[PDB]
Amino acid sequence: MKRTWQPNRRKRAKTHGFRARMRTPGGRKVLKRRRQKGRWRLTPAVR
Amino acid sequence: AVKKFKPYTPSRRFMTVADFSEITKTEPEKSLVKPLKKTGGRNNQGRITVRFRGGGHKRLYRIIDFKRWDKVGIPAKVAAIEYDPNRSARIALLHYVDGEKRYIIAPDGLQVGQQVVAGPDAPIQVGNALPLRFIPVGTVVHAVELEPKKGAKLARAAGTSAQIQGREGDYVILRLPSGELRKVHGECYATVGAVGNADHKNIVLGKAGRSRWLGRRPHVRGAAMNPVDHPHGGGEGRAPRGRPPASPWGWQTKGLKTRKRRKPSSRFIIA
RNA sequence: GUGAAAUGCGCAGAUACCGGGAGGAACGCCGAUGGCGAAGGCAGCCACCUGGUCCACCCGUGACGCUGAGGCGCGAAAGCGUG
RNA sequence: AGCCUACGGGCAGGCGCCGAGGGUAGGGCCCGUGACUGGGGCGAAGUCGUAACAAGGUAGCUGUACCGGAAGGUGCGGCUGGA
RNA sequence: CGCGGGGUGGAGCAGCCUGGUAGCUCGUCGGGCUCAUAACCCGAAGGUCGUCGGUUCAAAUCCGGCCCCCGCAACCA
RNA sequence: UGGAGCCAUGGGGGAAUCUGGGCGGACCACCGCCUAAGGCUAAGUACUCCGGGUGACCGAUAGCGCACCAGUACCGUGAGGG
RNA sequence: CUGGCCAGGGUGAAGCUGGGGUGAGACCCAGUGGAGGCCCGAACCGGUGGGGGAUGCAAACCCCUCGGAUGAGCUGGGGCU
RNA sequence: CUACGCAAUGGUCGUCAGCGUAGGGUUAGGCGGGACCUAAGGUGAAGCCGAAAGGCGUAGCCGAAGGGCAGCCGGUUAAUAUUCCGGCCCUUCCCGCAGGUGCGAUGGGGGGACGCUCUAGGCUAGGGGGACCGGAGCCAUGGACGAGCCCGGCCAGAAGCGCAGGGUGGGAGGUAGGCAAAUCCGCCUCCCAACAAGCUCUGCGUGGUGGGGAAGCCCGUACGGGUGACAACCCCCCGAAGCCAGGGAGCCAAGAAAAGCCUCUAAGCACAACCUGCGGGAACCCGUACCGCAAACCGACACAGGUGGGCGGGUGCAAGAGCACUCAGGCGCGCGGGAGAACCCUCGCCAAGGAACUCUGCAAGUUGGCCCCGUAACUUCGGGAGAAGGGGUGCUCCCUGGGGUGAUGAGCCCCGGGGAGCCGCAGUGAACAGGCUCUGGCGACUGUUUACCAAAAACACAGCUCUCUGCGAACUCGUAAGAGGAGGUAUAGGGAGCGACGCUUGCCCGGUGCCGGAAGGUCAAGGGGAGGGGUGCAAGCCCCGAACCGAAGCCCCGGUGAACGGCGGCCGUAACUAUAACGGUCCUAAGGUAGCGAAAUUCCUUGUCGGGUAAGUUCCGACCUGCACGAAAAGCGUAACGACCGGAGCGCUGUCUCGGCGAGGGACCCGGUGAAAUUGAACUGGCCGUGAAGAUGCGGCCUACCCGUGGCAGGACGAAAAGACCCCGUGGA
RNA sequence: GGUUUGGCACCUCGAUGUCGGCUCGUCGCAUCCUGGGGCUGAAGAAGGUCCCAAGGGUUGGGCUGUUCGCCCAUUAAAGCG
Ligand SMILES: [Mg+2]
Ligand SMILES: [Mg+2]
Ligand SMILES: [Mg+2]
Ligand SMILES: [Mg+2]
Ligand SMILES: [Mg+2]
Ligand SMILES: [Mg+2]
Ligand SMILES: [Mg+2]
Ligand SMILES: [Mg+2]
Ligand SMILES: [Mg+2]
Ligand SMILES: [Mg+2]
Ligand SMILES: [Mg+2]
Ligand SMILES: [Mg+2]
Ligand SMILES: [Mg+2]
Ligand SMILES: [Mg+2]
Ligand SMILES: [Mg+2]
Ligand SMILES: [Mg+2]
Ligand SMILES: [Mg+2]
Ligand SMILES: [Mg+2]
Ligand SMILES: [Mg+2]
Ligand SMILES: [Mg+2]
Ligand SMILES: [Mg+2]
Ligand SMILES: [Mg+2]
Ligand SMILES: [Mg+2]
Ligand SMILES: [Mg+2]
Ligand SMILES: [Mg+2]
Ligand SMILES: [Mg+2]
Ligand SMILES: [Mg+2]
Ligand SMILES: [Mg+2]
Ligand SMILES: [Mg+2]
Ligand SMILES: [Mg+2]
Ligand SMILES: [Mg+2]
Ligand SMILES: [Mg+2]
Ligand SMILES: [Mg+2]
Ligand SMILES: [Mg+2]
Ligand SMILES: [Mg+2]
Ligand SMILES: [Mg+2]
Ligand SMILES: [Mg+2]
Ligand SMILES: [Mg+2]
Ligand SMILES: [Mg+2]
Ligand SMILES: [Mg+2]
Ligand SMILES: [Mg+2]
Ligand SMILES: [Mg+2]
Ligand SMILES: [Mg+2]
Ligand SMILES: [Mg+2]
Ligand SMILES: [Mg+2]
Ligand SMILES: [Mg+2]
Ligand SMILES: [Mg+2]
Ligand SMILES: [Mg+2]
Ligand SMILES: [Mg+2]
Ligand SMILES: [Mg+2]
Ligand SMILES: [Mg+2]
Ligand SMILES: [Mg+2]
Ligand SMILES: [Mg+2]
Ligand SMILES: [Mg+2]
Ligand SMILES: [Mg+2]
Ligand SMILES: [Mg+2]
Ligand SMILES: [Mg+2]
Ligand SMILES: [Mg+2]
Ligand SMILES: [Mg+2]
Ligand SMILES: [Mg+2]
Ligand SMILES: [Mg+2]
Ligand SMILES: [Mg+2]
Ligand SMILES: [Mg+2]
Ligand SMILES: [Mg+2]
Ligand SMILES: [Mg+2]
Ligand SMILES: [Mg+2]
Ligand SMILES: [Mg+2]
Ligand SMILES: [Mg+2]
Ligand SMILES: [Mg+2]
Ligand SMILES: [Mg+2]
Ligand SMILES: [Mg+2]
Ligand SMILES: [Mg+2]
Ligand SMILES: [Mg+2]
Ligand SMILES: [Mg+2]
Ligand SMILES: [Mg+2]
Ligand SMILES: [Mg+2]
Ligand SMILES: [Mg+2]
Ligand SMILES: [Mg+2]
Ligand SMILES: [Mg+2]
Ligand SMILES: [Mg+2]
Ligand SMILES: [Mg+2]
Ligand SMILES: [Mg+2]
Ligand SMILES: [Mg+2]
Ligand SMILES: [Mg+2]
Ligand SMILES: [Mg+2]
Ligand SMILES: [Mg+2]
Ligand SMILES: [Mg+2]
Ligand SMILES: [Mg+2]
Ligand SMILES: [Mg+2]
Ligand SMILES: [Mg+2]
Ligand SMILES: [Mg+2]
Ligand SMILES: [Mg+2]
Ligand SMILES: [Mg+2]
Ligand SMILES: [Mg+2]
Ligand SMILES: [Mg+2]
Ligand SMILES: [Mg+2]
Ligand SMILES: [Mg+2]
Ligand SMILES: [Mg+2]
Ligand SMILES: [Mg+2]
Ligand SMILES: [Mg+2]
Ligand SMILES: [Mg+2]
Ligand SMILES: [Mg+2]
Ligand SMILES: [Mg+2]
Ligand SMILES: [Mg+2]
Ligand SMILES: [Mg+2]
Ligand SMILES: [Mg+2]
Ligand SMILES: [Mg+2]
Ligand SMILES: [Mg+2]
Ligand SMILES: [Mg+2]
Ligand SMILES: [Mg+2]
Ligand SMILES: [Mg+2]
Ligand SMILES: [Mg+2]
Ligand SMILES: [Mg+2]
Ligand SMILES: [Mg+2]
Ligand SMILES: [Mg+2]
Ligand SMILES: [Mg+2]
Ligand SMILES: [Mg+2]
Ligand SMILES: [Mg+2]
Ligand SMILES: [Mg+2]
Ligand SMILES: [Mg+2]
Ligand SMILES: [Mg+2]
Ligand SMILES: [Mg+2]
Ligand SMILES: [Mg+2]
Ligand SMILES: [Mg+2]
Ligand SMILES: [Mg+2]
Ligand SMILES: [Mg+2]
Ligand SMILES: [Mg+2]
Ligand SMILES: [Mg+2]
Ligand SMILES: [Mg+2]
Ligand SMILES: [Mg+2]
Ligand SMILES: [Mg+2]
Ligand SMILES: [Mg+2]
Ligand SMILES: [Mg+2]
Ligand SMILES: [Mg+2]
Ligand SMILES: [Mg+2]
Ligand SMILES: [Mg+2]
Ligand SMILES: [Mg+2]
Ligand SMILES: [Mg+2]
Ligand SMILES: [Mg+2]
Ligand SMILES: [Mg+2]
Ligand SMILES: [Mg+2]
Ligand SMILES: [Mg+2]
Ligand SMILES: [Mg+2]
Ligand SMILES: [Mg+2]
Ligand SMILES: [Mg+2]
Ligand SMILES: [Mg+2]
Ligand SMILES: [Mg+2]
Ligand SMILES: [Mg+2]
Ligand SMILES: [Mg+2]
Ligand SMILES: [Mg+2]
Ligand SMILES: [Mg+2]
Ligand SMILES: [Mg+2]
Ligand SMILES: [Mg+2]
Ligand SMILES: [Mg+2]
Ligand SMILES: [Mg+2]
Ligand SMILES: [Mg+2]
Ligand SMILES: [Mg+2]
Ligand SMILES: [Mg+2]
Ligand SMILES: [Mg+2]
Ligand SMILES: [Mg+2]
Ligand SMILES: [Mg+2]
């Protein structure tokens, strides 16, 4: 039956995207954690 | 009159509709004034703040003139009476000689071709508007203002109307639709006559939808919910409140008066 | 308030009196063994729409009349439905 | 395919329509009977009150309406077959 | 059977806790009023206080034992 | 909350300029301390991404999660896990 | 907020039109018409009963059967809590 | 896509591949996005709010499967094509020339611009015929040289033409309005014109002309290449849900915005400028492979699941996107080969019986389409109705009535009516395809729900009542600003209960709640200070502190039931007996009315009678000592409706007496690949008995050669899950 | 005796599935039939009661989830554990 994951590029960018992370102070901190941790992607990879 | 239906289907055995002869000559609104994109949505910034709203036929908003002192002395011919999805009452589209057109909440009796105007001078005949003070005590009027120059706010629902009881200073005494006796400023405008389409109270929606077409979602009873949801909720197998009728929010709902006690707005009421 | 009482109302200021206001129903005297209507029934005053009926003149039609199963309408009060 | 023929034809025979009646199904009218139940009639003994007839001790009566152990009471209008 | 209320003239209730006093309405008996019965009026009689014991100077009354009456509760498998 | 002063102050009231005014644990009186409602000021102190030096520190299931192309593979929508 | 979708049948409301009827009416006939959380039934939505499956094809599935199917209908995309 | 490959990936194999290595491959002014518009919403100048972070928010800006905008038919590649090429046809910008005109906005107006259902007239897409046109060929196996059989008879196309439609009155005056600036809109007044014409804008046909063009045969790995003919390219018929489109009619629930685009004028500028022509130039950025109901997407997998839009041919069947077969096209599901056990699944048939099965006809059967007769109680007159129950149904020939298109006549399609007759067991001959009835309970009804054990009598529902709310409404969200309510205004909005409709909905304001009461009682801070204290030589500075004045709340007084709620006990009494209309007494705030009643409620209980059965703890009808109905947590009914729960019949059955046979997929044998939970170790028998009281493992006795394979499930207190019950914990929620 | 209702709380709560039916049984005898037998208030036929003896038998339905009962129709009997 219909599962949870229903891929949608626009949806993903708008939601977890870098620009989005940057607006909210919470999102900013995400980036801060990820960078400080040394992640190779601060944001979900999408094209 | 209210149209009735032979029961060729249940729900349509009780369903009754309005008598649309009144409106006639004009179905499509005035692309001029009227045309105003109306916003739907049953709630504010996020959360819903009025339960059970939503759905219901698309709806365009007719922009009516609730303050007639705009064009004092300038008369207008009642061009037509048309349907309006945003209110119980019907509306009358009128062309002023001025050339300008507006929408007035169509009073009972008013007819096409008939002429109307608003001002102190104005003749006391159904359709004209004048500051209450210049209106014969006793006559019935609708679309009344509460405070001068603030717009009509009283008696506008289909078939409603207020009556002038008497004067007393710069104030005139009105008996509002609810039966309340309130002192209203003499300068407040009011248009002579009663609202109209008074058969409105006589329509029987008929089915469960219809109620839906009017954008009214189903209303679920308290006792039917669970303790978390409502004070009446809970209890094994059907039950009686548990004392004393309350709302989902905790306040009593059978009798408890609610208007602000110390509101200055009193000292002007008596009913 | 009654036969007499009590219930009840009233010192939170009633009853009794004056002034103002709201509202609903009914129309005192005239008024009668009176009038009108087919019956039920109809009473302040004003206007509008309207039925019946009586008198006078012998003008006109020329038996065109009477009753009336059924049908149709009206029909006190109480009662019923929507407001 | 039979039998007779005066070789046209007739007869037996075969097929079909109709058909007494039998069958299935669903209706109409009438009769009988049924746990229990409604009201009725008559009662030489019971229980309860007293509604009505004399202002019958609240004039009676009446259509209707609500109520009451019961008769009945009360409201609305009506009658006189009461004053 | 486990908690608790209850048996008082013929009927129905007081009196018991704050032990020495049996009260109330009805009924029953006597007498009036009426022609007579009710109704009304006047006057009386009637109670082992369920039962056997216990405390006390004295027990309907306070304490226990069964005898009956009424009301709760008899849950989770 | 105590006998509750001292320091700060949201509300109300509301002075004085050295005969001024605060404090010395309620409050008075003595005796004494100090000058509120403007501001700045090294050093001694803290920490360790980074560089170096040591180690009765580990020695590839230990030591950092990672000695190795590891915050990777992979998992999760995601934060995150790893 | 903005788009899309719903085979084919069936029943035959109101209105009209004509006739009848009456003082006028109400009303009554046909014909026309094509209403409805109407009927049967695909797509589409659903999940009634039974069987199967139970280290499954499947962390809810398959077959048969069944409900809705112009509506309080189903559905894509864009949003909000 | 291609060339090399096969370790691994592929549930087997593998030379193959969606796999490995490598090289190619995606071409646009017109297709889709962006150098256009606005929707919800987001963001956000001003502005408001907030301890910080941050929350609001007019304009503006962003934001699209919506609006707007110029490409059709063919040809080529191993792999792209409305993109390259060919033919035909367009769009913007810039410049120049000519001819026109008050040109000119971010502003004004118009327009864009709109629902649902049903629909007219024309077309087109698409499809079926043809004696006609063009074709290679073919007469087999008894017959046919035949109007034979077989294959194909189109596409695109500017101007101009026609055929259908769509939009729209033309004038001249005034003018308080369009936040007047207007020659434009808008209103008035009056010559003209009118179920039009004219002017425009679409669609369709035609059009110079340009493409395409089979079956079969020959070559051929692949993919296709000549063939093919100078191919023909015509006539009828059916015909859209698509086009003309902004068409028409009806209806109530009353159906986006903005730009492009017309037009009006403002500043400005008129040697500007726009407008129409005609030339010559200029025209960017991103996407374009391939998969795309699936082995390439979401499901850990090449997973029987899930995934939006369009096309989706033919014959037949009443119709159809249904069903059966079938084109084009695509597939045979990435383990096979044998056997012919039990048993399992899915499937077919069955003597006699026909529910006896069983909790239950669960399951399966029966019935099934269409046409025609013909249909009951009851009813809210719609319905119940497909009630029931019957008959017809194929093929052949004769006769005959209407329609559409043609032309009134011919073929071609579309509905019919009447006669004769033929063959089978059977004519909706296969596939799709209701079993029916009677009678109860609940709920009025369509609808909604526990995604994944409940679809219901639960929720919702129209409708009824109560109650709050006079508008900066009440109420909800928020610290606030603000927002919803509502651009609504008591015929409205919130809250509550009941739950279509019919007939109704009694009595009790003692207690609780809410409503009303300018008096009293009590009552905090604060006001007030009689009077008292600590200190000082003191003036003083400090403390406590009674009277009395002091809100709401509570007390108190009164109301209120579709407010929370409640609605009696014991004795006696009437011709046999029963029973008690009546009476007595205690108590209460008042003692349950109508109507129902062993009920979705009745313990005793399978109550007692009736009914239905041969037999009936259920069911239906009654009675009423209702453990423990009862009026809006409604009461009693009710046509219709229901995959709801009960009881009966008829029909028919493998449910059953009672089982038998047959089929296919497994099971079994061979070849290939090859798991799992579980597992103290094992050399793991029966009976009595013993033992922590249920022993393969102790005792005694008995039985027993070693090892497997197909089967069955009594035991290993078999597996699984640190029992969901129970108690415990001074555990949790 | 160990089939009822219990009492006790000994193994089992890191699980010993708890009524009824169906299927398949097997055993006990305190025997329901059938076979032997003694008394009898046993004339006969039919019974009563006790003794021996399970070898084999020990029906089909209505009702209820029922076990059990009651009932219909039979039977040699419609046994209890
Ligand atoms: Mg996943
Ligand atoms: Mg997207
Ligand atoms: Mg890197
Ligand atoms: Mg917002
Ligand atoms: Mg509700
Ligand atoms: Mg619930
Ligand atoms: Mg509450
Ligand atoms: Mg609560
Ligand atoms: Mg209950
Ligand atoms: Mg409750
Ligand atoms: Mg007169
Ligand atoms: Mg004459
Ligand atoms: Mg009358
Ligand atoms: Mg009356
Ligand atoms: Mg009444
Ligand atoms: Mg009335
Ligand atoms: Mg016959
Ligand atoms: Mg009878
Ligand atoms: Mg009798
Ligand atoms: Mg009397
Ligand atoms: Mg009398
Ligand atoms: Mg009397
Ligand atoms: Mg009367
Ligand atoms: Mg009375
Ligand atoms: Mg009277
Ligand atoms: Mg006594
Ligand atoms: Mg006496
Ligand atoms: Mg006497
Ligand atoms: Mg419990
Ligand atoms: Mg301060
Ligand atoms: Mg201060
Ligand atoms: Mg100085
Ligand atoms: Mg200080
Ligand atoms: Mg100080
Ligand atoms: Mg000090
Ligand atoms: Mg100090
Ligand atoms: Mg100091
Ligand atoms: Mg300083
Ligand atoms: Mg300083
Ligand atoms: Mg500093
Ligand atoms: Mg510093
Ligand atoms: Mg350091
Ligand atoms: Mg390590
Ligand atoms: Mg090592
Ligand atoms: Mg993942
Ligand atoms: Mg990932
Ligand atoms: Mg009609
Ligand atoms: Mg329907
Ligand atoms: Mg259907
Ligand atoms: Mg489709
Ligand atoms: Mg779906
Ligand atoms: Mg669902
Ligand atoms: Mg499905
Ligand atoms: Mg299912
Ligand atoms: Mg289910
Ligand atoms: Mg299943
Ligand atoms: Mg199953
Ligand atoms: Mg199984
Ligand atoms: Mg079906
Ligand atoms: Mg279906
Ligand atoms: Mg959607
Ligand atoms: Mg989305
Ligand atoms: Mg190769
Ligand atoms: Mg392999
Ligand atoms: Mg490759
Ligand atoms: Mg650029
Ligand atoms: Mg843009
Ligand atoms: Mg924009
Ligand atoms: Mg916006
Ligand atoms: Mg914001
Ligand atoms: Mg904005
Ligand atoms: Mg777009
Ligand atoms: Mg577009
Ligand atoms: Mg390709
Ligand atoms: Mg080209
Ligand atoms: Mg111009
Ligand atoms: Mg506009
Ligand atoms: Mg031959
Ligand atoms: Mg053809
Ligand atoms: Mg052409
Ligand atoms: Mg059409
Ligand atoms: Mg714009
Ligand atoms: Mg492609
Ligand atoms: Mg699929
Ligand atoms: Mg598809
Ligand atoms: Mg596969
Ligand atoms: Mg798949
Ligand atoms: Mg789909
Ligand atoms: Mg067809
Ligand atoms: Mg068909
Ligand atoms: Mg099919
Ligand atoms: Mg093929
Ligand atoms: Mg058989
Ligand atoms: Mg047979
Ligand atoms: Mg049979
Ligand atoms: Mg049976
Ligand atoms: Mg049985
Ligand atoms: Mg079945
Ligand atoms: Mg039915
Ligand atoms: Mg044939
Ligand atoms: Mg045609
Ligand atoms: Mg069929
Ligand atoms: Mg059918
Ligand atoms: Mg029942
Ligand atoms: Mg329902
Ligand atoms: Mg579920
Ligand atoms: Mg259902
Ligand atoms: Mg109702
Ligand atoms: Mg606040
Ligand atoms: Mg609004
Ligand atoms: Mg409401
Ligand atoms: Mg309301
Ligand atoms: Mg309810
Ligand atoms: Mg009563
Ligand atoms: Mg009260
Ligand atoms: Mg009360
Ligand atoms: Mg009271
Ligand atoms: Mg109060
Ligand atoms: Mg004080
Ligand atoms: Mg002193
Ligand atoms: Mg007070
Ligand atoms: Mg006696
Ligand atoms: Mg006697
Ligand atoms: Mg007697
Ligand atoms: Mg009761
Ligand atoms: Mg009763
Ligand atoms: Mg019974
Ligand atoms: Mg009960
Ligand atoms: Mg019972
Ligand atoms: Mg029972
Ligand atoms: Mg019987
Ligand atoms: Mg039976
Ligand atoms: Mg019986
Ligand atoms: Mg049965
Ligand atoms: Mg019954
Ligand atoms: Mg109840
Ligand atoms: Mg009540
Ligand atoms: Mg109630
Ligand atoms: Mg109900
Ligand atoms: Mg009922
Ligand atoms: Mg349903
Ligand atoms: Mg159902
Ligand atoms: Mg049934
Ligand atoms: Mg087989
Ligand atoms: Mg093998
Ligand atoms: Mg043992
Ligand atoms: Mg050993
Ligand atoms: Mg042993
Ligand atoms: Mg074995
Ligand atoms: Mg097995
Ligand atoms: Mg086992
Ligand atoms: Mg186990
Ligand atoms: Mg445990
Ligand atoms: Mg919690
Ligand atoms: Mg035992
Ligand atoms: Mg035991
Ligand atoms: Mg012990
Ligand atoms: Mg256990
Ligand atoms: Mg274990
Ligand atoms: Mg023996
Ligand atoms: Mg013998």
Residue numbers in the entry:
A (entry chain A7): 1 to 47
B (entry chain AD): 2 to 272
Show me the paper's own sentences about this structure.
During the stringent response in bacteria, mRNA is degraded on the ribosome by the ribosome-dependent endonuclease, RelE. After the controlled degradation of RelB by Lon protease, RelE is able to bind the ribosome and specifically cleave messenger RNA (mRNA) in the A site (Christensen and Gerdes, 2003; Christensen et al., 2001; Galvani et al., 2001; Li et al., 2009; Pedersen et al., 2003). E. coli RelE is an 11.2 kDa protein consisting of a compact, four-stranded antiparallel β sheet flanked by three α helices. RelE occupies the A site and causes cleavage of mRNA after the second nucleotide of the codon by reorienting and activating the mRNA for 2′-OH-induced hydrolysis.
Under these conditions, RelEwt cleaves the unmodified mRNA inside the ribosome, and complexes representing the uncleaved (2′-O-methyl mRNA + RelER45A/R81A) and cleaved (unmodified mRNA + RelEwt) states were subsequently crystallized in space group P212121 with two ribosomes per asymmetric unit (Selmer et al., 2006). All three nucleotides of the A site codon (UAG) and two downstream residues (AA) could be traced in the structure determined with 2′-O-methyl mRNA and RelER45A/R81A, representing a precleavage state. In the precleavage structure, two nucleotides downstream of the A-site codon are visible in the electron density, and their position is consistent with the general path of mRNA through the 30S subunit (Yusupova et al., 2006). When the A site codon interacts with RelE, the bases in positions 2 and 3 are splayed apart as conserved basic side chains interact with the phosphate group between them. This rearrangement is critical as it helps to orient the mRNA optimally for catalysis. The reorientation of the nucleotides is stabilized by stacking of the base at position 2 (A20) with a conserved tyrosine (RelE Y87) and the base at position 3 (G21) with C1054 of 16S rRNA. In the precleavage structure, the first base of the A site codon is rotated back and contacts the P site tRNA. This conformation would be difficult to achieve with a large purine base and could contribute to the subtle preference for pyrimidines at the first position. In the third position, the precleavage structure is consistent with an interaction between the guanine base and the region in RelE around E82, which could confer a more direct specificity toward G. However, none of these interactions seem essential for RelE binding, explaining why most codons are be cleaved with some efficiency, but they may explain some of the observed variations in activity. Y87 is then able to activate the 2′-OH by acting as a general base, possibly stabilized by hydrogen bonding to a water molecule observed at this location in the precleavage structure.
